[PDB]
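Internal ticket - ligand job 653, methionine:
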Amino acid sequence: QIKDKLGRPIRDLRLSVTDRCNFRCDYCMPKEVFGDDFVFLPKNELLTFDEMARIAKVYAELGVKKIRITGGEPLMRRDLDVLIAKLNQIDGIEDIGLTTNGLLLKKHGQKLYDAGLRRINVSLDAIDDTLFQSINNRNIKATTILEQIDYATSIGLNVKVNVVIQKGINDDQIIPMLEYFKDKHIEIRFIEFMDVGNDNGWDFSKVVTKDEMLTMIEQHFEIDPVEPKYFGEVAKYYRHKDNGVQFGLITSVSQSFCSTCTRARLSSDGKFYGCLFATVDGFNVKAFIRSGVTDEELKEQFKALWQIRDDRYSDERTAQTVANRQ
Amino acid sequence: EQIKDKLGRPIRDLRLSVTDRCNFRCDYCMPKEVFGDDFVFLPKNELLTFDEMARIAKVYAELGVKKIRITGGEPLMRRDLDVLIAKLNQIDGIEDIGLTTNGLLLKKHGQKLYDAGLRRINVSLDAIDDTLFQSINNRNIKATTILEQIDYATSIGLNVKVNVVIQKGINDDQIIPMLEYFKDKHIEIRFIEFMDVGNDNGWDFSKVVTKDEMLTMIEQHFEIDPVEPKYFGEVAKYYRHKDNGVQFGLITSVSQSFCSTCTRARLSSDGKFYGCLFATVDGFNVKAFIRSGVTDEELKEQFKALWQIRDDRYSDERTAQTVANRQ
Ligand SMILES: Nc1nc2c(ncn2[C@@H]2O[C@H](COP(=O)(O)OP(=O)(O)OP(=O)(O)O)[C@@H](O)[C@H]2O)c(=O)[nH]1
Ligand code: MET
Ligand code: MET
Ligand code: SF4
Ligand code: SF4
Ligand code: SF4
Ligand code: SF4
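stdout (structure tokens):
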């Protein structure tokens, strides 16, 4: 079994398929920085689907059961159905997932289910049209996205929602969001907002802890804990007593998870990272695969890359706060 | 004055083992099979002297240690333990000195201990039923006796907390009469997940009552408020009886390991250094190092080097393995 320096297997491949997006959320792609000026990667510098297939295959032979398609907005990638179809004919890969803001689901959703997509996570940082429009900067109403989700549901897709909660900004949205997806039978998850200050420590200001979210919810709903599907399961799950619908609370900052992190990522221009955090550029997979290589030689470079992985960034920020508190 | 190890962690706690002897033969710790009639314990001369301990603790204080815990073995078996407490009480920088004990010997030694400056003790007590407890400790000690020792301890001015290790099938039906009994005494009881490494080799969850599991028996018999934490990445998750305001704790060692915030150094009873509770190999021989003749400053350089190369994270390795084992 292939394992990093901390003893973790490879089980997940996060696959970035584009640097582009039809939103300008300010945590993520603020307009100052990603303006009309901006030059996103030209066509021929993204990986072809057939290179993504070769990489996903070789990864499946080293452990990866699961693939997550991101960007960017992944739906901004043209002919995404083709990738989903290619990846879904690889036999070690059990589940394929796609993280979207959802806007393009009515346009491309059917061609993607046809191709083998059964499951999507829709980000949606707010349900009130005014606040959400002021988060996304592209004049798109939370209502629009609540209708793409319902069409995704209707074509047969399994939909889950990712909400990043921020104190002053995204706080008052927890309760109307729960109550909405409760009669919609969709599984919603509220994620702690992540942020690091000057002193390498955590930024607990805008962060509303799993402790604090539940104290709020348990006042407006009757709530039951659900024992973890598997062991080392990221999100914590609870259930509503009347209709047994579930919601999740991911504890990013107040409860780090680096020890069971099994996720390898490829960025939109074909670089390897062992962590959603990275100061330096990583191995240039693209320059490697285009210099001519054998599958079973691609297999050794990824394996060499994983075995030398020792990433633990949310752990380090955790170890720095204890160091700063001193 | 702040020293960090390979994984970013500062040194803060020193665990001092003062003896390899115990008056109990607990099955998960010292079973009679292994520690029987013929087990040779350490000769006197091969224990650290109280002067040696006082000197180690002084130099660790300079490296940022604030907290000493005295353990064993059963520490109350080490003769003249009050001498040690007195010397440690004289070390600047050391804020908290604690004792972990089975509590059998508190009436015997407690006053002399208090006299010398001890104020805080944790008492291990795995059951409150007498028959079950005899069969846990294997030396015919009733739980009633330990409860009498606990009450004497509080009466002379010691702060008592209680530590309970829960194995499913054994003492898991002790969770509610122990919660209740100590709620009434205004005593802080903490419940610890049983640590057992299977085959294999990730955790063995057989027995093993989780946090959730444990907190579901509790929520049915008592009416509970969760407590916000003292400090970032704090040991237990605390809770509060609404009555009343008594606290209990839930130490989640297997379901959620705390290695990334682990701040403890240990000296064993044979005077070896360990960076972790677990340990497959012999530690640096600190006792032979001191007895070779070294200055304080040479002792310091060594503790410091010993801390900077530290990368122990035993429980997180097991957790990682437990993930890897599923596949
Ligand atoms: N894995 C691990 N468990 C620990 C560690 N320190 C304490 N524990 C657990 O906590 C239990 C009781 O701890 P004690 O030695 O009495 O002291 P403490 O609770 O850590 O410290 P206090 O806050 O002073 O009460 C032990 O039985 C341990 O299993 C540690 O460093 N690592
Ligand atoms: C870096 S986030 C990319 C996925 C998607 N555009 C979302 O945020 O919902
Ligand atoms: C390994 S525990 C050592 C301290 C004490 N004898 C215990 O039983 O509380
Ligand atoms: S939608 Fe997703 S990718 Fe686009 S900017 Fe907002 S968060 Fe980022
Ligand atoms: S910081 Fe990196 S290593 Fe830790 S979980 Fe986040 S992704 Fe994994
Ligand atoms: S009393 Fe303490 S040291 Fe003695 S066997 Fe039991 S747990 Fe271990
Ligand atoms: S396993 Fe070792 S490193 Fe981890 S917390 Fe326990 S003592 Fe610290």
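Auto-summary: Residues 262 and 274 of chain A are 9 Å apart (CA to CA). Chain A touches chain B through 29 residues (CB under 8 Å).
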